[PDB]
Amino acid sequence: RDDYDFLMQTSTYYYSVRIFPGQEPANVWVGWIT
Amino acid sequence: PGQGRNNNGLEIGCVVDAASGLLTFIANGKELSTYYQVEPSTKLFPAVFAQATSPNVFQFELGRIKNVMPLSAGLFKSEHKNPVPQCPPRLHVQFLS
């Protein structure tokens, strides 16, 4: 699958947000804040 | 582009490269044009701003994609080299009050 060495050496992180059906995507913002 | 808006729940993926301070987004398996470049030593909190138009609004998914560590690896120093996604009890949802 993925490269284990790259996965260990990387400083990249991920997350996701699932907007459910029936919720307007124009009313939802996704990202990061300080 | 043109979607049905409801075939599957929309999955907006946020990717943070801390070694370069680069913030990228994925709409549906597709890289978005919007990107951000943060200053070194910035501390970024995952955030969602939502105006509820349904009893079910959204959900954080603390998984991972190919060649990217999960969020728990960067959040917790004890899991800095743990590819398995985790949601420890310390991590919780806060709201502006």
Place this chain on the structure above:
Amino acid sequence: MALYNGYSPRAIDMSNVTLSRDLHAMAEMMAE
């Protein structure tokens, strides 16, 4: 948006959409 946009019966989970007060009154009167 839509203009530019064996068997799978899969359809849309639809009951989660909201309606305003006027929309609800519309639905009530037309169901009546």
